[model samples]
Target: KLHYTTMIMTQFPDISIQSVESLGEGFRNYAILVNGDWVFRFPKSQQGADELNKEIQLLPLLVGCVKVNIPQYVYIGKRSDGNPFVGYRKVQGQILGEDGMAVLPDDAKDRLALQLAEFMNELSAFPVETAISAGVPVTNLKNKILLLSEAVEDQVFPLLDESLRDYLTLRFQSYMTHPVYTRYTPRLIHGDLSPDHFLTNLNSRQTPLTGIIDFGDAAISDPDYDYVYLLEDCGELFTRQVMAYRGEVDLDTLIRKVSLFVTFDQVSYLLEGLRARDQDWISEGIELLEEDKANNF
Candidate 1:
């Protein structure tokens, strides 16, 4: 870790770094908090470094689009032989978990819902052409759906509950056959719009979302990929708030596509668990199934 910190110090020799402590790393990068102000990420592979570069490029365009704070890149450093590093001013706030959300008062919950609603509404409303021009990849919706169905059929069906399997099968079949489910116009989206990426002010009496970070999975899609994460923990109020944010109109196909994508995200996780044959994945897959039943999805 000191070696990487030293590398970062080499990039910006002007500022003195008091300490460099590790932050919870994701699948792609090793992130560290530097001097309590800057956050630096060292990618684990070429692909990870590439994604960090992608975030560095896209984030500037996203600065004024949404409600909350976003990570602003301060420096980008590359090595001749190793992956590059990206640095940004840390978006300060607490990352609320299920436990954190559970403790919130009723009003705060609704406030959080509205904040999220407005944020996503503004985010997805970004010009699609601009995003594509900036190199945001379009999600291959048809290919994604077909591949997921194949995974479930091959690995999950044998192990999953009969009822759960039937539900997923019907959903996937509908998605495959119905053009309405896949007819929505594409847009720029925060591909991984989970609570994990959100930063909130837990100290406030009212809900105050301070920042939103991580654009690793950001992509071009009209799918409900983000909503799935919203509904996962934010509950029906947030879902309905998102609907209201979307407004009342003729986005019928858009509605269906988003719903399918949201469902696809969860079911994909279940299939992944089965495919890996790992106990953690298997347990979470089934647990989410119960959440689905309760949510009436």
Candidate 2:
């Protein structure tokens, strides 16, 4: 069992853990509700412990700089038996997803776009060195492009159907020869900013953005990376909002990065689906890759 109640408690002696229920499982960490008002996170693997420490340190700094609501670190607990744990206040809000998207009216989209752009603009204003020191390395566009190219060559290309293989080969060749260039600066990037990570409070006054959660992937990188999620999740309207805020648009760079990252990001999922002998995930990724190649972002 991932979570269990213990009669003997030493780490948090004052606060009783009435019931421990699994919240969700991610690639590296398991979330649980503790005492119904706190969240307890346990590292699922050794690699996860390193990431957890990075987030614990960096998230506080990000909150200091940006005007977004983030979880406050409540305490760090170590069991009498020597097990380690991290805790934070339980943020109250619903995660916006497909159902949330379906329910969100056009006005809600506008509100979300405004809030998201403001948050990102403020975040990007932070110095790159500050972000790098916090553990998000400044990745060069060339290196990013190369990494995706290699992934395509080794993993994706061979598995594609003949028609897609020909199309992607031409696409990759063109990108390699003349990669799109964008201004590079080490800016604080959310790394992952999909609608799922954004929390909404419908009951609150003004319907303000209540909280932003899951800092496990937060880092200092290109601000463009932050915009990429908006493009993927909310489509052109959000992209237009971002472009308007920045006052410029690099259509070519956006197209290149989206194509590259989609393949880079979804590889693990593709591999898992393949291992489980499920064609759906692989097919979905291929379709996305092909579509991205044909469409002008």
Candidate 3:
């Protein structure tokens, strides 16, 4: 794979082919940081490769929308061995996971949530028509929710504890009959705001949000959908700051759907684990589901 990657890199004499080193991995992609200046990502599966073109077209349009750095793929090309790769200028930041955020002082933590909140506000405000014109798919909450419900019932529920499975099933039924998701309109969402995706270099003297990557899961869905995970991590502080910025967002509807997506996303996650037949992943998902139930209770 490195040989094929180098073959692609060597074509550009300006880019030192020898400087290539594996940076890390993510879902459906392998990433390498070249000379600490260039970021290259190669899709690991058909799903990821197919999504790359969509991101290539979508990201350029998104750069000016938010107040942070986004991946601007400068070199997008295919390898002789059929690998597709993308290269972007590296944005400076230390990615803070749930653990990283745990280390911050109260003032810094508030600032982190504030800065992240503002970016979410800006990104969600991109015009719907413009997003449609870019060929970015509008996410249908009802349809997606229904699919997950079916998948859970068919696959994961069989593996879950009886009580946990029953609880999740009831939640699915409640979601299907729920009025909020079916009626509400969705806007462009960053989709994946997991701690790793939200980059912050506290010592860099810049806004806490230095980079927002992984647009492969981005959708034209509920704008408030962006923060569902934030609610889980930062608690209400995230939504409070966002509401303060985008005052028009409905507080009630947002909270209701955030609750919905908690189940929606996790169920989908566990479904994927079932498909992969990964016992560890399935166990992890079930444990998280139990914890989610405990916290909400």
**Top TM-score prediction, candidate number:** 3
Full-model lDDT for every candidate: 0.75, 0.66, 0.75
For residues 89-201, what per-residue lDDT tens digits would candidate 2 score against the true structure?
Answer: 87778877535655667667666666777888877787667656766655665566666667766876688777776666665565466635344566667777877777887
Clashing pairs in 2: 128-186
Question: What is candidate 3's CA lDDT for residue 89?
Answer: 85
**Each model's Cα RMSD:** 3.2, 3.5, 2.4
Question: What lDDT tens digits, residue by residue, belong to model 1 across residues 137-162?
Answer: 88877777898888777877777678
lDDT tens digits, residue span 5-79, model 3: 665567655686657778777878888888778888889888887677778888999898777888999887786
Q: Which window of ten consecutive residues has the lowest lDDT sum in model 1?
A: 248-257
| TM-score sort, best first | 3, 1, 2
The 10-residue segment with the lowest total lDDT in model 2: 1-10
